[PDB]
Amino acid sequence: MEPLYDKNGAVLFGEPSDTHPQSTLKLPHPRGEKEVIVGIRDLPRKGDCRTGNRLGPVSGLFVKPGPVFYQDYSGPVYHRAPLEQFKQAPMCEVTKRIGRVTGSDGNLYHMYVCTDGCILVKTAKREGQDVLKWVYNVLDSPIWVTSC
Ligand SMILES: [Hg+2]
Numbered sequence: 001m002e003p004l005y006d007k008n009g010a011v012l013f014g015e016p017s018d019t020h021p022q023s024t025l026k027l028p029h030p031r032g033e034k035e036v037i038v039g040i041r042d043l044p045r046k047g048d049c050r051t052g053n054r055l056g057p058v059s060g061l062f063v064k065p066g067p068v069f070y071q072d073y074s075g076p077v078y079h080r081a082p083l084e085q086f087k088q089a090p091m092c093e094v095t096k097r098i099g100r101v102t103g104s105d106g107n108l109y110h111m112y113v114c115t116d117g118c119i120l121v122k123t124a125k126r127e128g129q130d131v132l133k134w135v136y137n138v139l140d141s142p143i144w145v146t147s148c
Pocket of ligand 1: 110
């Protein structure tokens with residue numbers, strides 16, 4: 001299964017993989033001063049990295065199904081989409097584009113928030129056409145989507 005990573009970057013099981021170079025997540029990068037849930041209307045900004053914002057500290061953007069968005073998170077997260085928890089689906093109407101994330105297959109995916117509230121991924125590049133929704137979350141932990 002796709003591993004989880006702790007707030008220092010150390011993988012918690014399995015073997016460590018690097019993130020895709022054109023992902024919005026850039027490692028190494030600190031996080032986890034506080035767990036800060038935010039709404040889809042209150043997604044973090046650029047410039048928030050150092051100061052934070054009214055809502056609190058900011059290490060970037062995390063997400064799990066729900067949808068539940070965080071602007072900082074302390075516990076275990078994914079650095080790549082656990083595609084074992086994903087299933088093919090037709091393209092939805094997108095409410096929000098949130099970033100480019102690496103897949104457990106090693107490839108780059110665009111990640112969207114659908115109208116129904118599902119997290120969907122579409123392969124960013126190459127002759128790839130995959131449209132997948134995050135259906136399970138076994139370990140109830142978010143993907144680090146973007147780093148500030
Ligand atoms: Hg995108």
